[PDB]
Design a protein around this ligand. Structure first.
Ligand SMILES: CCCCCCCC(=O)SCCNC(=O)CCNC(=O)[C@H](O)C(C)(C)COP(=O)(O)OP(=O)(O)OC[C@H]1O[C@@H](n2cnc3c(N)ncnc32)[C@H](O)[C@@H]1OP(=O)(O)O
Ligand SMILES: CCCCCCCC(=O)SCCNC(=O)CCNC(=O)[C@H](O)C(C)(C)COP(=O)(O)OP(=O)(O)OC[C@H]1O[C@@H](n2cnc3c(N)ncnc32)[C@H](O)[C@@H]1OP(=O)(O)O
Ligand SMILES: CCCCCCCC(=O)SCCNC(=O)CCNC(=O)[C@H](O)C(C)(C)COP(=O)(O)OP(=O)(O)OC[C@H]1O[C@@H](n2cnc3c(N)ncnc32)[C@H](O)[C@@H]1OP(=O)(O)O
Ligand SMILES: CCCCCCCC(=O)SCCNC(=O)CCNC(=O)[C@H](O)C(C)(C)COP(=O)(O)OP(=O)(O)OC[C@H]1O[C@@H](n2cnc3c(N)ncnc32)[C@H](O)[C@@H]1OP(=O)(O)O
Ligand SMILES: CCCCCCCC(=O)SCCNC(=O)CCNC(=O)[C@H](O)C(C)(C)COP(=O)(O)OP(=O)(O)OC[C@H]1O[C@@H](n2cnc3c(N)ncnc32)[C@H](O)[C@@H]1OP(=O)(O)O
Ligand SMILES: CCCCCCCC(=O)SCCNC(=O)CCNC(=O)[C@H](O)C(C)(C)COP(=O)(O)OP(=O)(O)OC[C@H]1O[C@@H](n2cnc3c(N)ncnc32)[C@H](O)[C@@H]1OP(=O)(O)O
Ligand SMILES: [Mg+2]
Ligand SMILES: [Mg+2]
Lengths: 260, 260, 260, 260, 260, 260
């Protein structure tokens, strides 16, 4: 559809991966309400499509997302934070059932780093940079900059970034555990699509159950997380893909999953 | 007693280290019911042995453990998994009170990675590989593979492995946090025994309390985890080894612990 | 004030950073009760000063802190713990609202490692070393040596250090996530003061909210932690520094925070 | 609007209370998808309405709600539950930030008891009956019938109701703590509206913060829940109603809250 | 089988309920090692029986259980308690998948109250009494006496019983939430068996899922409890009894469950 | 002493119970900073006094405590609450390791209800009343009024009291779980002292462990709470009172505890 701030298209072979690109190179991909709206619409369309198995959220080659639009929240009041339209539709990424890969190129600061952290996998470019400069403008992160970041890179580095606003390179993010792979700036998006393709080639119902169990590691205690994982594991046997997948292995052949 | 799938013996000076070697070079150490039953028996006898202070779990030079036998759970239905005696004796390692070290040589896939992740310390070989290919056969990890992994390597890398099934090298595991030390393939087992020897050289009662204190980090909040650690710290003053160890510091000599 | 174990002074330009140096180059900065008292007093004075924005905790070039004085706790009984004046004023550093940076040079063992882990940021020297040798004296870490360590470096490395007492290098500490920056031995203290200055230049009220939100990651679930972050983010709009910081950005100028 | 299964209207003086009634006497107010969709619409309309301060959910004199429509979920398969439009929009009532009072008359079984427990306050009639008969049809509660009930009436009584499917009288629910007030069958709705009017007479912002603080008790530990309550207590000081409410108290007059 | 301290028999029509009666009227059913072992054996036998659907745990008319045998743990030591197993095998009731009903007649003190609290449902006689007199002998509860009690009766009453050792009447336990139904002394066992029969008539697989859902209300947060309950609810559709139960309702007939 | 708002004295035989009375009949025992400062001092001296075993907190015959002084927080700013001295030192009552009983007579509103809930046991008079009218002045509870209340009386009643500011009778508090015993207005304090004396007749070190175990119910999961109870149960064997208490029981005599 006609989008002013993003470009939604299905990339890769078999049209199984959905690429959501943020088109705003004049503001370094500023996350305004209009952009967030289009982003949520695209995510819903790809999540409600049987062909799409995974989504790849990317930006530009110079900056993935420079965070929220300060020009909009400048004059916001405290009362305008609780009972208003402003800043309420940011956590839609956390309610998606299909895997979402984050291709980060250039600056990913504030809302951008929060947007990437909300995604399952994060692929960063050789020149990518992450930071939480909220402290430099008199505010703190508001979408996971102090919760997901701390759990990923630890307290020592999280405290520094959040309290100093300094940037970390893609290498430090890889070494700290924030990102899983570093790819060239020219092939970052292609590598993310290739990864999404491999993920979409598996049983979607099982992929969702897996994502749910992995995400449950930050909301439960290990003892209960294990029991919840085993219950989801038991439930996999109710699907036909489980029988097909295991039967293919014993017969030494490729499995043909039907998403059921 | 006789064993068909494992080799159990005591190693190290004074025979203070119990070695459990998975012996099935034809199935890449497939974790079948027979192997798990013998593994639990080997863990039990070493647990009830007052001479053994630590246990070392190892496999083969090419494969540590390939996971559960897919040929056995192929025909299993949902009703069987929930209330039938097939997949119910995998979590005995979590109940072992003595420290356990996992000498991972070669493939540690699926149940193997979980088996190693359930131990306290994991020593990996130069050519060791870890993966969670459950998604490739139409299922998800069922022994905490999505809980302990996520807590160690992070959501980004854990999500990829669980959703893509791709392998990670020993170097990637050491940098993430899954394994602590990388050893040559020919010296892995001996170095793990040498580490177990150092552990067994301390008071077992205090070694058990310390092991329980570390495990509490994944089951309680940081506030309550510190209070529990405080009470366990106070409990050490009720043992003779505490007085002996501290007295062995003021007096410049070697401590002679008595496990009491 | 006159101190016998520490040297409290305000370093850096404009006197915005408070430095607490443990001066005991004969027992490797053994954390005696008298030292802990002076340390708590210095922390209180800096925390109750409108000029100090951040604190830097450091020791000697050869040793940061060798842990609690075993000479004192040698003869303590089980009743003397749960019920006396012994080992009770250690966790005061956890209640300090202002950021604290740990400049670790040389040995940081036992209580010294826990003392460093209680801080928000840890800068380690090239020759610095961390360890938890409590197991060698018949005791276990009782001030967060297992809780804050396991959550940072992982179970495998934490279990090893706690059950073996081996020393990890500054490089390994950074790769695991315990420390954020590896600074030269001759410039460690200066770099830490510079970092503290960069933190003390931001809105103190916002810096406090940021620290508390990051600490919440270890006390709450990811869902509730995100909602607590939301309310804290909303509360920033009630301060004057929030508007000044954002207006300066829109106007492309420097922000002059008033700490309110 | 044109509702086929509900009757939404603003009752009470000043139209500050929104009444949502379920009109399906021929099915004991069975919760079908159409009924739930209309229920969610009425909730959103009253939530966005600036005049409505509280909502009152009620049914018939003989049945509040007899649970979900079994005729619809009869042929549903396991795959249908994890997809395909089925059973997703039931928890919308928990996201309503405004207080909701449940006026229960007659049968409140299964989904009806869950819907009542989802509300903040529950007023039951002299003849009201609560039960969880899911077990009698080969299923279990799926919208909190095993979590909120257990937390209110205890494990002993919750187990009996869930495992046996027996009913409890309004007198039993009040003594157990499930309902707060027992009103006559002829004046249950009026008393519920009166309670809603009293709640809609104070600052809506403070009412929202209060409701969130109460729900916080079931999502965190007592230590963290107290700190959030304290932070919310600090936050309300930024509102004008806080100053007006207290000023009126000091001056012995009626406070005129402006909801800001 | 041959039991010296208990009487295990299968009571009720169709032999679907297993009754475990503690036969020791000379020590008020003091829970000794031998008694606990026999109790565990009887539980295991009933749990591994395809006919028994529920278990009824009862004692004498004057005493259900007077707690652990002080004559055995008198000369015990801290070392013999932490490492050497002398007190374990008590939590065998927490691992039972089938519902267990506690018919409490007379004294239920210390271990007896803990034994009853570990069961799912508790039926108390008109003259039954509950207490935690551990404080009177210089000890505290050790089998969840403080955890399960505080979560049912409240902090005020729990604190009083634990710090004073006073007894509460069956009526008080009923109003507080520790007992669900008060039965006459001469009909307590029969009514308890009747309730067990009502539980032993539904799908065992679904009854187990329901019990596990209720037990989970004390191990995690509400938001996570709702998710697990919803997932377990979805899983019930993979069983045959679910379809049979719902089809019988639509057809207005009795359901014939087959435990699958 | 020279107190101006309270009357602290040691009542009961042998002077083993410390009575703290709030003397302010002209303000319904308003909790101002001066009262709280003296209350903390009275709690400190009684906690350090080796003869006092329990404390009893009481008010007047007409009012226990009418909440914080509104006239002192009227002109407070959002920055003052977060940075200034105002509204601090209220949680000291929760840090008292010795048991504390709350004798509530008359009004217990706002801060008074929270102050009473902070104690371990609450004895209420026949005419006592509890309420949380904070909502009527444009504020919410700020000392656990929602956390501890909801966890005791339930969500249904807690929501009503917090959102309507309605008063509940002493009978309602007893049936809900807020108070444990109701006593005549003329003998409330005497019965409270008698209860405190009973608690003071047992081993203080064990009484402390017991209180710590009960408070643990509101900070951890049921699984972890049970394990901590066991460790505290094991730690009790290191005390001499444990041996004395059990030795007296088997010998049918009265135990002479030595507080160690
Ligand atoms: C609860 C739901 C909402 C909560 C979400 C959390 C709140 C937030 O995210 S706060 C926003 C965080 N702040 C930031 O991330 C950093 C702000 N941006 C910057 O500092 C810099 O622009 C930076 C470092 C990224 C790159 O700087 P630089 O290369 O020098 O180029 P710069 O001139 O500044 O940017 C070019 C254009 O991008 C604009 N821009 C950059 N970032 C933003 C932004 N966050 N908002 C609005 N405009 C922006 C610039 O203003 C400029 O536009 P123009 O000249 O037309 O006015
Ligand atoms: C908690 C209750 C249970 C929960 C546990 C969680 C569930 C699981 O663990 S699922 C099992 C894990 N999944 C996998 O391992 C995917 C399997 N991929 C492989 O197995 C590959 O063998 C791999 C990559 C390890 C090595 O590949 P490769 O070197 O080419 O050897 P391969 O060709 O497969 O043959 C070696 C022998 O090992 C057998 N084998 C390997 N893995 C398994 C296995 N998991 N089960 C049974 N047999 C196996 C092979 O079938 C083969 O035997 P054979 O010639 O008689 O047919
Ligand atoms: C509230 C809960 C708080 C408690 C939480 C956990 C409890 C603890 O912290 S236990 C203490 C930590 N344990 C340890 O450090 C094990 C000790 N190993 C060492 O201390 C070594 O000295 C080490 C490795 C740091 C450096 O050793 P090295 O360079 O060879 O020199 P060394 O001779 O040992 O030290 C020089 C002086 O420091 C003293 N010293 C070193 N550490 C300590 C100490 N922890 N306590 C007392 N004195 C110490 C030495 O005794 C020696 O003094 P002296 O010559 O007068 O006898
Ligand atoms: C997020 C996941 C989704 C959310 C999970 C929640 C889903 C659930 O698990 S809840 C489903 C469980 N609910 C129940 O079991 C209660 C079922 N109802 C009954 O058992 C009885 O009707 C009962 C006990 C209320 C007594 O009613 P009674 O006085 O005997 O008269 P009865 O004839 O049964 O009812 C009159 C009409 O109501 C219908 N009715 C009653 N309940 C239902 C129902 N739950 N569904 C459909 N129709 C119903 C009856 O079928 C009958 O209609 P008709 O004659 O036209 O077929
Ligand atoms: C990891 C943790 C696992 C273990 C944790 C469990 C911790 C515990 O349970 S500690 C035990 C706590 N229980 C108690 O304190 C209650 C002890 N019993 C009593 O106080 C009283 O006997 C009471 C009130 C029940 C009834 O008293 P009363 O009616 O006057 O009759 P009484 O004479 O005392 O009892 C008759 C017989 O029962 C014996 N008996 C009663 N209780 C016990 C007991 N707990 N242990 C051993 N013998 C007991 C009596 O000693 C007496 O035997 P005998 O005449 O041969 O000496
Ligand atoms: C975060 C750290 C701090 C957080 C703690 C939480 C914050 C709070 O507690 S907010 C305060 C909440 N408490 C209240 O709102 C109740 C205020 N009290 C009342 O309203 C009365 O008790 C009431 C009407 C219920 C019964 O009182 P009543 O017998 O009718 O006569 P009343 O005039 O009100 O009382 C007599 C004297 O008591 C004074 N008084 C009563 N309550 C207070 C109070 N909370 N503060 C100051 N003075 C009070 C009255 O002002 C009056 O004094 P005066 O004649 O000199 O003006
Ligand atoms: Mg890491
Ligand atoms: Mg109750």
């Amino acid at each position: 559809a006609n989008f002013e701030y993003i470009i939604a298209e299905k990339r890769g072979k078999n049209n199984t991966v959905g690429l959501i690109q943020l088109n705003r190179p004049k503001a370094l991909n500023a996350l305004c309400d209009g952009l967030i709206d289009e982003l949520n619409q695209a995510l819903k369309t790809f999540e409600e499509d049987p062909a799409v198995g995974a989504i790849v959220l990317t930006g530009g080659d110079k900056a993935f997302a420079a965070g929220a639009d300060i020009k909009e929240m400048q004059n916001l009041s405290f009362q305008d934070c609780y009972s208003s339209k402003f800043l309420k539709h940011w956590d839609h990424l956390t309610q998606v059932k299909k895997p979402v890969i984050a291709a980060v190129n250039g600056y990913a600061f504030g809302g951008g780093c929060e947007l990437a952290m909300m995604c399952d996998i994060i692929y960063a470019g050789e020149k990518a940079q992450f930071a939480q400069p909220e402290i430099l403008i008199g505010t703190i992160p508001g979408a996971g900059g102090t919760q997901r970041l701390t759990r990923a890179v630890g307290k020592s580095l999280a405290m520094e970034m959040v309290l100093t606003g300094d940037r970390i390179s893609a290498q430090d993010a890889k070494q700290a555990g924030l990102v899983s792979k570093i790819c060239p700036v020219e092939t970052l998006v292609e590598e993310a699509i290739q990864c999404a393709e491999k993920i979409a080639s598996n049983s979607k119902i099982v992929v969702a159950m897996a994502k749910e169990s992995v995400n449950a590691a930050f909301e439960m205690t290990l003892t209960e997380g294990s029991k919840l994982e085993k219950k989801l594991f038991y439930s996999t046997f109710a699907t036909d893909d489980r029988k097909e997948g295991m039967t293919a292995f014993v017969e030494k052949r490729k499995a043909n999953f039907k998403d059921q």
